Amino acid sequence: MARFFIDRPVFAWVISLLIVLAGVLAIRFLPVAQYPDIAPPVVNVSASYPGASAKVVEEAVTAIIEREMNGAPGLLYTKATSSTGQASLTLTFRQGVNADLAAVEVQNRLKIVESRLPESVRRDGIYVEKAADSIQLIVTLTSSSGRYDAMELGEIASSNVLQALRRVEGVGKVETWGAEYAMRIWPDPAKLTSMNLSASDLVNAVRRHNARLTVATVKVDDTLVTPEQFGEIPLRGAIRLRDVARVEFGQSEYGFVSRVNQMTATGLAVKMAPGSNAVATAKRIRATLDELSRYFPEGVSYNIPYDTSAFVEISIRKVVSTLLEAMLLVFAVMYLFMQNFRATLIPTLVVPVALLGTFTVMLGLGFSINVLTMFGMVLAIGILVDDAIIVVENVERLMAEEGLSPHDATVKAMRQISGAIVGITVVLVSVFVPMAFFSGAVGNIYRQFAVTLAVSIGFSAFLALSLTPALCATLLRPIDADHHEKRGFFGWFNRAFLRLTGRYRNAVAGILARPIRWMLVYALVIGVVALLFVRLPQAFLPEEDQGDFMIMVMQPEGTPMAETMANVGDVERYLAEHEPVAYAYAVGGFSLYGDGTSSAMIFATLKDWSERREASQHVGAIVERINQRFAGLPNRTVYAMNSPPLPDLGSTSGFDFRLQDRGGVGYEALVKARDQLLARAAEDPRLANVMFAGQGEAPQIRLDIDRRKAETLGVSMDEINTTLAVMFGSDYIGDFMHGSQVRKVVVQADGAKRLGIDDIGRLHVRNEQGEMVPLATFAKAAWTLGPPQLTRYNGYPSFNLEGQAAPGYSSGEAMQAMEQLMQGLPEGIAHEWSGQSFEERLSGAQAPALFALSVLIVFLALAALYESWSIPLAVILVVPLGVLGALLGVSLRGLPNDIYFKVGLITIIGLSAKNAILIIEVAKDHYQEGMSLLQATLEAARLRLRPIVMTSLAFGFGVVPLALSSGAGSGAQVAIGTGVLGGIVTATVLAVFLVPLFFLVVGRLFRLRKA
Amino acid sequence: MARFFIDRPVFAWVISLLIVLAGVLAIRFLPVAQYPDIAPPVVNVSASYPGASAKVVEEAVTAIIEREMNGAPGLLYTKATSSTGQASLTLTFRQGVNADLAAVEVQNRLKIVESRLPESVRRDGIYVEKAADSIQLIVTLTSSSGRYDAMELGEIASSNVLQALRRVEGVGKVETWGAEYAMRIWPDPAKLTSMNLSASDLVNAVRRHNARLTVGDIGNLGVPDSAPISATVKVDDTLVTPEQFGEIPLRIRADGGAIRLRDVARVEFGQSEYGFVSRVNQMTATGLAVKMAPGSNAVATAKRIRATLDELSRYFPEGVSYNIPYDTSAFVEISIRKVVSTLLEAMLLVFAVMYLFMQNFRATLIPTLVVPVALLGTFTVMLGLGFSINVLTMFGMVLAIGILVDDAIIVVENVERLMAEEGLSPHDATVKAMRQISGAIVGITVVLVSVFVPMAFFSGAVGNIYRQFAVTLAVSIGFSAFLALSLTPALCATLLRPIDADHHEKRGFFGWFNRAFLRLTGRYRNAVAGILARPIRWMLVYALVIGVVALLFVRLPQAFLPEEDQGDFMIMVMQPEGTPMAETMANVGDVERYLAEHEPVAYAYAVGGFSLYGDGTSSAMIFATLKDWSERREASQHVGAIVERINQRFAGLPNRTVYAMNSPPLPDLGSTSGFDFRLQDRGGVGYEALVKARDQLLARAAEDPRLANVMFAGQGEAPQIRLDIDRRKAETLGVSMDEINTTLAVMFGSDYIGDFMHGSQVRKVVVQADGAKRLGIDDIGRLHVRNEQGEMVPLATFAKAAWTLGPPQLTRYNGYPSFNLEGQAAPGYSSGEAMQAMEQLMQGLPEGIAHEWSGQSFEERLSGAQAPALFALSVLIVFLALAALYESWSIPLAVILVVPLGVLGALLGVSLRGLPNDIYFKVGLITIIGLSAKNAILIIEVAKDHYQEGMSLLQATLEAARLRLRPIVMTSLAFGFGVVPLALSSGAGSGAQVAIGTGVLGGIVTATVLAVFLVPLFFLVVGRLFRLRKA
């Protein structure tokens, strides 16, 4: 199609302009994130059973819900945890299903068995949510004036900040943590002993008293549901202000302890709406917070102690800068060689248009701009530059070597290269597309953009076959005699390169003269590539310094909120002393529990990477100082999540072993079996570190209820629960503490401070008649060592076991070994692989199959291009040369065989394949002219030397910055750099000295002949 | 293309290899199903109202829910089954509606009307499952020996098998036909009355104790104050043992609450399901039904079910083995396999014919290479379009083979002509021949595709079926055309060697064949000249042929799809309602022993308490899987004869009426093998009047010869206690709440206090009154409803026994009371004829009684309407395409005139073997019309060329026929041989192949014999009448 566009420059210009406009609009509309969503759709079901035993919770809430959920469409697996007071059922759904529809179905299935569940949970209501536990940005309002209560600050936030943030563009939810104003019934612990508490009766009286008219403008506007109104409501001396309530309550609604750098604030979490540019949304939030800060009564200073958007923005900046600098370097190299400003301008114009077309296609398919997208964009710009530069170089050499006018030179050059261009486009497509077939969306994105960037070279089949030929036909002007080659650096460089080309041709002739030796050298290259590939660790994503670290203080099942705050303060002080933390906002609860008193979350934002340049000031080293040194206390399990990777799914050899099947075996029996299995796994060499992730059994106490005696007596079982409520009892609620606002009322013995332990099996219980009779007479409290949380997998109480494969042992091999080690365990116990293990069990041989398919397709396409069944074999043989350099560089650097490295290796393969195809095509053309194989090969090597050198130099120098990255996203950049740079260097040199040898060998072997 | 691919053989080979690889991958990814997916989205809303009769359930649950759902988007039709104690609502939505979204809408409407439903119904829960109503798979846990009893096997299945079966993808509903091992309590109404204790109060106390006890939130979390010990007191009073359930306290007297459950009830950890008795091959085993969700492939789902069962067996307790006694998809798999083998045989036969004619291995080889490439490309296109690997698509490929070879045959023959006559090099000969024949190839392909174009425009499920076949065939033909323009030219340019020096007609049998064909050609030339001598006579003969075609097509009966030997059937053993389960299973065992003794039955699963007609103690069904078709190759051992023998063996048994049916064809469309008829009652004529109309219609069906085995699916009325509760009395007495009435009714039925933790899972707690006491005639009268004030107010105050004959269940089809009248087509009468006979007899029934067809019958009526118009449109399109091809408005008329001969052949073929006008027949008719038109083109084009050259019209026709005898015979013979295995198929899937092959074979046979003697006549007559100009 080149001839058409060469004749119609305005046509090609129009096509390019359309592409550019589409790209601009696509960038305007494209979603932006750090990483694309890869996690399978997951539905979280949460329920709260106030004051319920973990075993009780498992028996009623967990089991029924889990059993009913079985049958939902595409329910890949079900995991359930039964803690005390609450239960969580994570339902992992197979990929391809819409999370929203799955959530609706889950809600309906919950409705099916709503009645069976206990009434208290029914009041609380089962909460179903699509798994989106991504708090991207956090806003906190500290007491700037030092005169604002935590609940007061929270009131200011909810009144103003809450709604405005909800209205802000791209905000999924703005859930809050700040403490509120709820009442807390605070009776003495002798209330039952002196007269009676019977708080159930008076709370029921509270609910009954609060009433509204049922019939129409007439209504009642009288309702007393407040601490002050509790002296006016009948609270059943007895309990009231008029009766004896005395100690009312305190701390309002005690909640998440929010301290921004040891300064009280209000917890206001924010999550980005899925599909919205995080950076731009952050900007919106910032402006809105400025306005609201001006609103604030000069005590509500807004602080951002956490914003993931910053790292996303800086990484995108790094990539975009890399693109711009690469274009600049391409300009530099093309000026160095061509020495014609217009010729320099041509590819500098062509390349961005193809990039914009890639952007358009990306928006069309729905792929979102992410660090993977942009990082691979930097991979294919070199390939983008390569095709434009080879086209324009072929055009200009004809203008120089011959006297063809720009139009004629363009026509002849396109006649020479066009078919090769088509073939190369097809080959690159067939080498990049197979990456999509992987069940990893990482590879899918790294495909889609790279595929449409080789089809940006296909847009170049509408540009480098349409626009670039047109531009060369018009922008290029005939060489000004030899004025382009003066006595300056440019001219000397040109002459020197001519001398170098002569030397190179002589060396290539020498190599061809003794083919056997150099083919043996190539076989040695194969061996070296193999051995380097073997001695290389495997990884999925290189972690980087996000600029923030998360700490969780796990403490014994329940610790006094004062004690938890003490430990939090200790951690915060340690961070403020020996760590470079810009903001160290601390929030109680949260962590794994979500509101657990023992649990505590520390969101600590590091300083700028510039001041933390020292390796000891890297997030890895900073987290290393935490979790030990200061941390590591026996009871105080303070662990810092070391920059949790945004795709929290990468696992090299993690084994999600689940001893799910109970088959009736007691919990004790399952514990025994778990111990035996983990010991044997440790013994077996195929297996590596094996742990029981479940928390070890903690000390506890049980109370065998005197239910039989309560049958004999007037004491009801609910009366026994009420007596517990008197002494060890809470979590009920009230309503309308402040107007329409619904708050809670909680009974607490001896006001706030009960200070009682011997209350266990000691308190008396007045019967239905009212006679004081200790339930301890027949009910007994006994010390125990029960488990903290009960985990059930797929409807079977399970012991989640996490293990890795031993060094050098295959992950699947180790999984088979795990199964065999289990084999022989007591009957009723079985295994069920989950997560990475489950997916691997489903299919793990996709990679070799699609690689072989890609090789076959490439061979067939090359056979079509060369019109022979033998010539492509050389192009196939070219491949390992590029791999050699990537392996060498990654080995010297010490970086692992990460996804970045693999994709860069594929890109290097593509570049070297393009160069080889060009070389061999030109050599074949010369041979078909009549020139002997040797001489034709030498001529092709001479001709296809300068474009290859220019391509390699430009791309390598563009990649060098990434290979020398300094923090702020350094990991991924250096992986990509190292890989691509090594591949480029070795690929280029070995190619220009071996591909002629390959063609010569094939020609001699298969007796290639003229047409 | 032609010259391009000729000059670059490597490129052509590369393209073909790419197509082959794509086909291989597509086959690897293509789904497999017997018939193209035609299942409409269906959602079954099931509810239970224990202690309520069919009338009570109808008026309290089914009516309200049906009214609410009425008006939903899509919702093609609504089927309501108000059984006694259970409500069923099958809502069938229109094809294409998102099943999940429809289910969501149903859930929303259920939410709307939930507040008006009985509270007990809410407690039981309304299960809205997007499932079908046909038991595709059965899983039976057989004990090795008496290690596990029925209850043990049922519990094991529920603990492990049930959840995993529900977990697999594609399953819609897993019915349980075993036991649940749930706490069974048996309160004595006599004892309760003697102690003046209401059963509801007992239920309340049991639920009270069953409820798990709780604690507070002080001493562990928040502010535990001085709690260094965890001291999170773990409630230890939950009751599991039946003794503990007995211990539950009841009304406490002055002496004490000595009255417990044990005093007035029998507590035992027995099974909860007493209404299902399952035996596999006369071996007691628990059973779990599996109904595939609509939209599932139902083969891969079966495979994954088998894999999951394998793993569970790996973890089964010693002595438990899973077994599948009834699988529908196995026939699908084996039939697809057989069709593939038939395709291979057809390829071999076509190769044989082409070698017999060309007599050169390479020239014969080229089309043989062409065939599979086109087939694989068609497979890839099918994958792109979503067409699954179906019997019709595979039929399309099998028919395609012979329609694909011909193009390559023509190309090769032209290349041979030029290479030999003009002494051209294979390259040059190929180039010139391709230059001359490319347009002809493209045109012929276009006409062929045109003939199939309208058949893709059918509507409905038959629309999908015809579309799949037609598109498959058309794509195959298009690929053949492309290959004949790309691959075949290259192969002829390179593979074809120059004609062997002095080719002495390949002396031998080939030489004899050539000489005999030359003599036959002379005789044929003389015959054609004789026909042309007196054109009027032979044209009159052709008009007579048209009349014969019309007569035959009128006589031919119309049907939907031929029945096949599925290899599995179902024996509905019906007993009078109320018949004890024990003797019902005894009769079922009699039937099973008869099966084992005489019939070739591999597996005979027998379940008592389940039937398509209804679920009851009398109801029973035997899912029997036959032995392999190879062992049952004898006609007497085919499924039909077996079913007839079973029916006759247990005929004349009103005490135990036994009816055997074959597995319903197209199970997705309908669950009834015979045509399904709904006798709805639009007008308020009345239930009794509807009964009278039903009986009258059934008598008419019995006397009508065209109808057989026409009966009411629902069981007859049984004498039952018609306990009525006005519930206004409940208002006056102070109860003012049906909840206590509901508790008493479910005490008569099955009351559930709640659930208790058992072993690893949670089992149920049931309180059913003792069997003898429960069946007590005046137990309801003697019992007292607990008043709101606790008063033992006599339940008889608003209880009226009033024993009366009552229907066991009620059916409301499309919001109208209806009676399901299933019927079978009598021998010698097609399904369409049987349905029309049912309609004719329906005329004369009283007003307000409306006839209706559902399932396959509805689709059959829909298919019948649109059949002729699309065929006429096919004829029109073909005529216009030919007119374009010949660049005249006269010449195409002859090619159109050719069609009736092929139609005659198809009609004769089906008439001789008694095959009705089914879907396969119409498909074969379309294909035959196409190929006959192709041959007519082949002859007429040469005739036209000769005429315009200067040869006289008669001379032109004669010479064209002489030159075309060999190609026409070759192509027709290739196609015919390719279709031969279909007509001669025997085994699983034999019926479909026999139908289509018979039609196509007859058509092609006449579309050649009649063609070679009338197409020249047609050309001569047209040339004379329309004065064809020599231009």
Residue numbers in the entry:
A (entry chain C): 1 to 215, 231 to 251, 257 to 1031
B (entry chain A): 1 to 1031
Give the original sentences from the paper that presented this experimental model:
The cryo-EM structure of MexY reveals that this multidrug efflux pump forms a homotrimer and adopts the overall fold of hydrophobe-amphiphile efflux (HAE)-RND membrane proteins. Similar to the assembly of many other HAE-RND pumps, the cryo-EM structure of MexY displays an asymmetric, homotrimeric architecture with the pseudo-threefold axis positioned perpendicular to the membrane surface. The conformational states of the three MexY protomers assembled to form this trimer can be assigned as “binding,” “resting,” and “extrusion” states, where the periplasmic cleft established between PC1 and PC2 of the "binding” conformer is open, but the periplasmic clefts in both the "extrusion" and "resting" conformers of this pump are closed. This cavity, compartmentalized into the proximal and distal drug-binding sites, is surrounded with several anionic residues, such as E129, D133, and E175, and aromatic residues, including Y127, Y613, and Y659. Based on the structural information, these anionic and aromatic residues may be critically important for substrate recognition, where MexY may prefer to bind positively charged drugs. Within the “extrusion” protomer of MexY, the cryo-EM structure indicates a similar tunnel, where it vertically connects the opening situated at the ceiling of the central cavity up to the exit site located at the bottom of the funnel region of the MexY trimer. Like the extrusion tunnel of AcrD, this MexY extrusion tunnel is surrounded with charged residues such as D100, E129, K130, D133, R166, E169, K173, and E175. In addition to the extrusion tunnel, we noticed a formation of a horizontal tunnel at the “binding” protomer of MexY.
P. aeruginosa multidrug efflux Y (MexY) is an efflux pump that belongs to the resistance-nodulation-cell division (RND) superfamily. MexY is also able to confer resistance to a range of other antimicrobial agents, such as fluoroquinolones, macrolides, tetracyclines, spectinomycin, chloramphenicol, and cefepime. This efflux pump is an inner membrane protein that works in conjunction with the MexX periplasmic membrane fusion protein and the OprM outer membrane channel to form the MexXY-OprM tripartite efflux system.
